Amino acid sequence: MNLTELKNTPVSELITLGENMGLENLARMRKQDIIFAILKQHAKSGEDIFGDGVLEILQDGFGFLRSADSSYLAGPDDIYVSPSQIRRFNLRTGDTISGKIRPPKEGERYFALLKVNEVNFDKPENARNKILFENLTPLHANSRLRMERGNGSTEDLTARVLDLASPIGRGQRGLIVAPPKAGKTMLLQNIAQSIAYNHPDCVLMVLLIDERPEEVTEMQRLVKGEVVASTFDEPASRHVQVAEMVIEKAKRLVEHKKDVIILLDSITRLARAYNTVVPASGKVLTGGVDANALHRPKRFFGAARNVEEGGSLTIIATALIDTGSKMDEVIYEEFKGTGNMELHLSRKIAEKRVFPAIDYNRSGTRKEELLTTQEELQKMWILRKIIHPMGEIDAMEFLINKLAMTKTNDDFFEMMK
Amino acid sequence: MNLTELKNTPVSELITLGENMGLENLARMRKQDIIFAILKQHAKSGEDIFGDGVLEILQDGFGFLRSADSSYLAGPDDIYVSPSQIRRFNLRTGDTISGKIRPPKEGERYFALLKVNEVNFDKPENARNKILFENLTPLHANSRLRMERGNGSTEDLTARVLDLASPIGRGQRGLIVAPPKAGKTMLLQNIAQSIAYNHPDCVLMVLLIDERPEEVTEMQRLVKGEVVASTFDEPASRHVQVAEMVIEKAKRLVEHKKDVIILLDSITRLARAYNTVVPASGKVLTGGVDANALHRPKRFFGAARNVEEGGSLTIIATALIDTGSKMDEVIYEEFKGTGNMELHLSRKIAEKRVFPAIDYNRSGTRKEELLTTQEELQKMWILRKIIHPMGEIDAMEFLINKLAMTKTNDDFFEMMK
Amino acid sequence: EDMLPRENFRPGDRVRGVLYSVRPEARGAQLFVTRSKPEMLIELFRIEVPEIGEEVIEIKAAARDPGSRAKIAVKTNDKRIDPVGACVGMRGARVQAVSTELGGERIDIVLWDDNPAQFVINAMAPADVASIVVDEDKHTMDIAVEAGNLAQAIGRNGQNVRLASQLSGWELNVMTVDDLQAKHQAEAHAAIDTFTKYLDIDEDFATVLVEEGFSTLEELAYVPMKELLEIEGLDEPTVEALRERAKNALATIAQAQEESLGDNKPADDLLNLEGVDRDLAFKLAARGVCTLEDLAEQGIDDLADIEGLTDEKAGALIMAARNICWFGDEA
Ligand SMILES: Nc1ncnc2c1ncn2[C@@H]1O[C@H](COP(=O)(O)OP(=O)(O)O)[C@@H](O)[C@H]1O
Ligand code: BEF
Ligand SMILES: [Mg+2]
To answer: How are beta strands B49-57 and B96-102 bridged, if at all?
Structure first.
């Protein structure tokens, strides 16, 4: 039996199934062991089991296949895969596996793998001889990601302004610099909605680290793609675990020539969790920050690139600033000259009920000539030169009034002439 | 028990009541905690409390209802209102609330609201679906405010000359440009007296910023309407607090279709307090003035308008000039082409014991055709053309001698022919 | 106590509720959250239903037998919306969502009315009710149902009724379905023995007039002539016969109360021991036993802590009882 039907189904149908199977009182335990016992019973009376997930290789030698909805956490639902598969198919951490699995006998409790069927949505023969991630040649973004939907809703104008200020492409690095209280959550939500509606072929992934759980549940069923999130409820170990999980999944997917898009929020909280989880190296700056503690976050932000051979990886990680502490400040300083596309959201415009609060004067993107055409770039430069002498709130309201009447950025540009 | 009876009563009756209630030594503390303890005792032995005031919403989420006599200041007398009311009735800053309140238990010390009864002198049902302030359509003043009382006293002639030089209407902006030593205090007092005697239906509000306390106490019980004043005794924080308080009260009242009239003195001192209270933006001109520091005062002066839907708001803010510093000078330059009715009071006529010292040649009002009739306007223009070739002191004494004999401006006009 | 045999828990899952009591002066954990409270579902709608929260609708009542039945009653103060049609969603889409959030409990949106009659009629819907009566002095409602919809009239534990008795707060009465079930004429001519010896001179005067009660005789004995005018012939003999009937009624009510307070019937088969007196046995048998056959099965639990008894006296009485019943085996 397939696994996803029982994973993404509501727990009520699982309770009904477990009560119909004539089992122990099922509703008295976790969803994890509930579905574990359900699979065990269906295997005792039924055929082989069909499971799937993402693979993580420990320092022990074997591998664990974990599901997306549990944010790839340990439990009875994981799938044990012996090192024999890692020697035969030459598996790697983050490999999306799906195949046949069997029940465990004494000495074991996890469902052992029987035969793989789909590895990263590809045949094992094609995946055997492949190219590594770091062995690829990065490049600049050439195909621009169209964020305008075309309907011109009450809030899609935000995305429109984004297209006006930061042309995003396959392989670009986006840093959203915004203090709290500024309204970046719905901004990222609309960005994900538009990028899934306009580009449904490329995989979309979001990551909420140290975030409130209510936002996690309201985003995990509002946008497309698996919404993996590690809320603040758990220690930093789970945060670095899910970070490696998602980064290896993205690396494998882009190695299989797939345009991967990551939405990370926030990066300062992820770096703080990294700082408290990795052992200290002795050297400490102000704010309780270590030297090597930023190495792994840096790597995580540097993984994104535009691959020349096939596919690309575009990360969009937001940096939370203006909190009072020094951790976020030093993180934003270390990541300032890192991303090639910054987007500043000043709270001065946000507190005035003027959304989206976008600091167009301080925002920009490098190498935009490889994403837009000639006259489009000329119009963008003319608009930038016109708006630059203005302030922030006045320029924002002027742009809002000039964009509300029009429905498309092209008509906006020609009417601004 | 109602709140206003204990608020506007002399402190002696409060001392007698607190001594009769068999309480601690009451006269040893502020009036604020005195009335707080009195209300607490009356609630411990009595029914629910009945409070009222103006609402201010902080950046925290809750709201504070403050009284008018304390210039809306913090203390034990404030009323805490939870954000649940701000979500149910959709409250806003500056809402005039009056209703039932309860005593506080442990963890709290302010009287919590139980049930609102009157919101801005209106039913909550009628106030639910309403129109915003900025969403209204400003217009020019059409109904002229008659400032002549008709008795022709020794000092009301001042008001008469005012009607001769600046026809005031519902929705006009008045800027009194006068150096010190010039006698504007009693001028504004007489203006308030006349506008309350002739138009008692419209609310009248005065504001004394950075003013001597003796004038505050002598004006708070000489004219009608709540006399809210922030004397120089307190820092600029209280000044901007009371500015927002009064402006939001006026906005709510004019949203409830009420003719609001504000008397502000002086505007240069208010702008200076604004300049020192709001953080600096880097750009600084001569005299220690910031660029954005005038934005909030400008807004405050621009709030006044003539609403087409219902009611209007008429502000009369006086600008103190000729002090030596550059702050007042640059403020008067920035506000010169701002108000649509200037009234100049030269000190040359004031020092000569010739009151009211009114520069009729430099005074005037735009769009006066929408406030006066045809022949009245013709007579006014004839009088202006006659007086213009004259100087200042000679014209002033001529007008005084021509107005003392007559009692009404109409007979004055016909006798001037 | 707020949990359920079907509502089930183990460390790891997220269960929600409403914080109903906070005792910051306690010794330990003092954040008491419940789930069985009715208004809970109200706030659920507040976070789900867009109609609630803006005052355009008014969720008034909620009858929640946890795990059995969770009905809601709303009212619309506006004149352009419906109470049930807008809140159900689109053929059970949001109501079933909040149900499966609450644990799959059967949720039916009932429409309460301004009167308790239609309220309890709708609360026991869809079903027919042949009689609806309200009683203020008894604080009850008589709901007599007809035959034809019993499968929806009672259900399990009378849930369709159990909500109503829990919503209005009045202990309803759904007992009898045979003749005179209307409760309006169930006392008119069903108990005719009321004027036993009242009209002792003759019998052919007029038709009987029940509209006064014939039984109260406290709001009827001494009243002005305008209230006793329903029957003609109010002379001194008539008022004296009425007073005599009232005295007889008082005596009967006093005897009935004296008999009903002592729900034990203490006969002479209760004071055969040495040391047993009136109030001793009165309390001992008011504790839940009837005769000697049901007292030797206990010990110092019931026979001790009685007015006029010591622990040693209790032990003595219980050993005497066990020797005369358990060790004797005689009848
Ligand atoms: N209508 C008037 N009649 C007589 N004296 C007046 C009149 N108006 C003003 N004055 C005199 O002018 C002086 C102005 O004092 P003050 O109120 O401090 O000036 P300002 O109002 O400019 O601050 C007063 O002392 C008052 O005697
Ligand atoms: F009273 Be003065 F005009 F400062
Ligand atoms: Mg003065």
So the answer is: antiparallel
Instruction: Tell the CATH topology of C268-326.
Output: DNA polymerase; domain 1 (1.10.150)
DSSP state of B368: G
DSSP conformation class of A64: E
- How far is it, in rounded angstroms, from Cα C35 to Cα A362? 50
CATH code, residues C185-261: 1.10.150.20
| Resolution in units of Å | 4.2
Can you tell me the distance from the alpha carbon of C19 to that of B108, in angstroms, rounded to the nearest whole number? Answer: 19
DSSP C57-96: SEEEEEEEETTTEEEEEEE--SSS--TTTTTSTTTTSSHH
Domain ranges in chain A?
A: 1-126, 129-417
Compute the distance between CA of residue B287 and CA of residue C128 in angstroms, rounded to an integer.
Answer: 87
Say how far apart CA C257 and CA B372 lie, in whole Å: 91
- The domain covering A1-126 belongs, at the CATH homologous superfamily level, to Nucleic acid-binding proteins (2.40.50.140)
Give the integer Cα–Cα distance in Å for B158 and B403: 10
Number of Cβ pairs < 8 A linking chain A and chain C? 20
In terms of CATH architecture, what is B129-417?
A: 3-Layer(aba) Sandwich (3.40)
Q: How far is CA A21 from CA A26, A29, B205, in A?
A: 10, 17, 77
Q: Check B107 against C55: CB less than 8 A apart.
A: no
Distance CA A366, CA A343 (A): 12
Alpha-carbon radius of gyration of chain A: 23
C79 touches chain B (CB under 8 A): no
Q: What is the DSSP string of A218-278?
A: HHTTTSSS-EEEE-TTS-HHHHHHHHHHHHHHHHHHHHTT--EEEEEE-HHHHHHHHHHHS
d(C-alpha A380, C-alpha A389), whole Å:
15
User: Strand pairing of B173-178 and B341-344?
Assistant: parallel
- By CB atoms closer than 10 A (0-12, 13-18, 19+), residue C139 is exposed
Interchain contact B106–C (C-beta under 8 A): yes
CA distance A70 to A91: 22
Q: Do A29 and C10 touch (CB under 8 A)?
A: yes
Half-sphere exposure in the Cβ direction for B414 (13 Å, CA): 5
Which residues of chain C lie closer than 8 angstroms to B87, CB-CB?
Answer: 53
Method: cryo-EM
Q: Are B5 and B12 in contact (CB under 8 A)?
A: no
CA distance B60 to C107: 38
B174 - beta bridge partners?
Answer: B316, B341
Q: Specify the length of chain C in residues.
A: 331
What is d(CA B67, CA B9) in angstroms, rounded to the nearest whole number? 13
- Of B206, B355, B358, B403, which is best to mutate to test ligand 1, by the most ligand atoms within 8 angstroms of its C-beta? B355
Task: Tell me the H-state helices in B50-155.
Answer: 83-88, 124-128
CA distances from B254 to B95, B198, B249 (A): 11, 20, 9
Which ligand 2 atom sits closest to the C-alpha of B183?
A: 3
Q: Enter the tokens of residue A104.
A: 């465990």
Domains C185-261 and C268-326 share a fold: yes
CA distance B266 to B239: 12
Helix (H/G/I), strand (E/B), else coil: A95: coil
Taking CA atoms, B68 is separated from B225, B229, B256, in Å, by 10, 10, 19
> Least CA distance to A29: which residue of chain C?
C10
In Å, how far are A180, A212, A271, A318 from A324, measured between CA atoms?
11, 20, 16, 17
**Interface touch B128/C55, C-beta < 8 Å:** yes
State the helix-helix crossing angle for B236-255 and B267-277, rounded to 10 degrees: 120
CA C331/CA C323 separation, integer angstroms: 13
**In sequence order, what E strands does A85-210 have?**
96-102, 111-119, 173-178, 203-209
